[PDB]
């Protein structure tokens, strides 16, 4: 399932790229001869006018052939006869279509609706504070209501998240916080965490103490704690939060546990032994919380705007990553090869539909970006050729053209072997 999913993903991506190249070329009166989809022998070919459409065996890549690209042919439809501006346009047609496809599919997926976690919409209530964290260190008691941070007035958890990420980007350290508890506006000083890298303020929302899943073969599974059921007490201890359940199982450390559960209306006292699991030397129950979300649907204009700025954001992120790797900041092993994208496609196949859309858009934009970096025999190399020819005013020497093509072929082959061995190494781990 994952393999064919990756195959159709790469097929539609290359289809979009070559289709954009094809329309953009057609908009400048050039004849197209070959419309290869992939590589290897043509698995099937159909002819329609000059469009000899065909799909080949190896779906790794995809190639197109025009009429009179570099040959000294003076026919009006010849690509070489066209001015360097038009040649640059044909060069840029493909990745432009890739980017527009990514932005439009992001707009559609945002319009359709995403299952945003429900805890992101209610007003902020601190239902639990992690032990010996920043919130505990300042003195944020559980059950309080945060009302002001710095600034930006905060109402829901989304406002808090945006405020903290904005403060982290601004590089501020101390921030005034106005907290409410029984109606006193306490003023405190909070160290701004670098949430960009991952660390968080250690604030937990109120979560209902209801089980949504149980691991197969877990001791709770052996007892018979089905998913979707609610629990009152642990050995007589009153608990109103699933994080209280987490605290109780953490402090159990292996003692006998008498869970008093409401089996859809009946009281059951189930005995369990969450001893030190040999996998990690810790309490094991194999039980999962009941995650509750809500589907959010965005109108078309706002969905388009959100897709637009999200696209700008992660495109800037990809540009920064490219600059880092070209400067040696990040090791080359983090790139995404065909096997890596195939395995992430399989993970999305196990994930869901919105996963399909989101990571399809992600690989599309990543490939479009890759098709712009200046490399010979790449969608981002003929732009360099046309630019230098236009500014110099004369065509590149034929021997120099052949050497250009040869070194480009060499370097692209080496990079494919490099990504293959990197993917094999990733498969090993």
């Amino acid at each position: 399932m994952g393999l064919i999913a990756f195959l159709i993903l790469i097929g539609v991506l290359v289809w979009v790229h070559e289709f954009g190249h094809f329309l953009m070329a057609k908009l400048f009166r050039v004849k197209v001869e070959i419309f290869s989809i992939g590589f290897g022998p043509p698995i099937f070919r159909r002819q329609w006018g000059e469009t000899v459409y065909q799909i080949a065996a190896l779906p790794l890549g995809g190639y197109v052939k025009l009429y009179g690209e570099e040959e000294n042919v003076h026919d009006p439809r010849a690509f070489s006869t066209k001015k360097p501006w038009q040649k640059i346009l044909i060069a840029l047609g493909g990745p432009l279509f890739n980017f527009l496809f990514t932005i439009l599919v992001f707009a559609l997926v945002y319009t359709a609706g995403v299952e945003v976690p429900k805890y992101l919409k209610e007003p902020v209530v601190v239902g639990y504070v992690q032990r010996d964290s920043i919130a505990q260190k300042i003195g944020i008691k559980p059950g309080d209501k945060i009302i002001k941070i710095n600034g930006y007035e905060v109402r829901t958890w989304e406002d808090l998240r945006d405020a903290l990420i904005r403060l982290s980007l601004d590089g501020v350290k101390e921030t005034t916080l106005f907290l409410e508890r029984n109606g006193e506006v306490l003023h405190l000083t909070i160290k701004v965490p670098n949430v960009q890298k991952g660390e968080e303020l250690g604030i937990a929302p109120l979560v209902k103490p209801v089980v949504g899943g149980v691991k197969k073969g877990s001791p709770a599974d052996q007892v018979g704690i089905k998913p979707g059921d609610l629990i009152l007490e642990v050995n007589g201890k009153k608990i109103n939060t699933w994080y209280e359940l987490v605290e109780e199982v953490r402090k159990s450390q292996g003692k006998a546990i008498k869970l008093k559960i409401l089996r859809n209306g009946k009281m059951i006292e189930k005995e369990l032994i969450p001893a030190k699991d040999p996998k990690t030397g810790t309490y094991f129950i194999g039980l999962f919380p009941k995650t509750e979300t809500v589907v959010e649907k965005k109108p078309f204009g706002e969905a388009l705007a959100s897709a637009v700025n999200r696209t700008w954001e992660l495109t800037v992120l990809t540009l920064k990553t490219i600059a880092g790797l070209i400067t040696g900041k990040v090791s080359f092993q983090t790139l995404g090869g065909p096997i890596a994208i195939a395995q992430i496609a399989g993970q999305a196949a196990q994930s869901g539909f919105i996963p399909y859309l989101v990571m399809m858009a992600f690989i599309s934009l990543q490939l479009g970006i890759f098709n712009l970096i200046p490399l010979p025999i790449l969608d981002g190399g003929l732009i360099l050729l046309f630019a230098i020819e236009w500014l110099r005013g004369r065509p590149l020497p034929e021997k120099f053209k052949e050497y250009w093509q040869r070194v480009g072929l060499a370097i692209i082959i080496t990079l494919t072997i490099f990504v293959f061995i990197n993917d094999i190494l990733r498969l090993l781990r």
Partner: antibody, heavy 124, light 108 residues
Framework: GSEVKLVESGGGLVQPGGSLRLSCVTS????????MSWVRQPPGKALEWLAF??????????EYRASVKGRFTISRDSSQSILYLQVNTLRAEDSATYYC?????????????WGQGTTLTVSS | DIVMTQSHKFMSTSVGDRVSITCKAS??????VAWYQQKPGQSPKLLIY???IRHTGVPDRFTGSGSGTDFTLTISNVQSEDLADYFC?????????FGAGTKLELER
């Protein structure tokens, strides 16, 4: 104003089986707002955390290494920015450099500023 | 309890080179790890916390990385002022434990 500064006192030579109190004088920061600890560094040995004490909003509660619980006691002065450590039943293995340290406020206690340390030698 | 094992007691390097000091935890500690530097006769000094966050004032040459059990502190372009002892520390669970330390030896 003045940068964070910690100065320990009370070290020296003490016979086995005795008792003493080490002191740590702090300056440059609000004393009642930071965790304090008495991590020790034996000669040619790894650092050994001994205890830490929480802030005012957390009731000044203490946490101890299980091996030293009931033997070592950390505490703060009531009206001055001085941290104390009472030690009894001294043995030759307690001979080390004892460091007083101020911790940051991030997630989970780590030690962002260390004092110069004071050396204790326990022998007959 | 949690034991921090530094496999290397000594490590050789030259000025301007890059050194990678490894640190292995007895069990999963996530990212609740800090790193310190101690020069002879001086107190330790925090360089990295949360596995990868550099402290304020720490040069860009010091980088931390790793997750789970095999954390690593990489020092690109070793300067002469980096001859010191470097050790890790975990704060995932109590009691807090430190590594045995790693001394930087110069090649010649």
């Amino acid at each position: 104003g003045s940068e964070v500064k910690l100065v320990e006192s009370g070290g020296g030579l003490v016979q086995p089986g005795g008792s003493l109190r080490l002191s740590c004088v702090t300056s440059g920061f609000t004393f009642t707002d930071y965790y304090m600890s008495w991590v020790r560094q034996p000669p040619g040995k790894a650092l050994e955390w001994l205890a830490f004490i929480r802030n005012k909003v957390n009731g000044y509660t203490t946490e101890y290494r299980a091996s030293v619980k009931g033997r070592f006691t950390i505490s703060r002065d009531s009206s001055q920015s001085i941290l104390y450590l009472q030690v009894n039943t001294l043995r030759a293995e307690d001979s080390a450099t004892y460091y007083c340290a101020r911790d940051r406020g991030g997630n989970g206690v780590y030690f962002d500023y260390w004092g110069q340390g004071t050396t204790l030698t326990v022998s007959s | 309890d949690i034991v921090m094992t530094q496999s290397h007691k000594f490590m050789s390097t030259s000025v301007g080179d890059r050194v990678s000091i490894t640190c292995k935890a007895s069990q999963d500690v996530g990212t609740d790890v800090a790193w310190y530097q101690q020069k002879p006769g001086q107190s330790p000094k925090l360089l990295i916390y949360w596995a990868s966050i550099r402290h304020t004032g720490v040069p860009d040459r010091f980088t931390g990385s790793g997750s789970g059990t095999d954390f690593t502190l990489t020092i690109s372009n070793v300067q002469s002022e980096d001859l010191a002892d470097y050790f890790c520390q975990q704060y995932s669970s109590y009691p807090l434990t430190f590594g045995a330390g790693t001394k930087l030896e110069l090649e010649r």
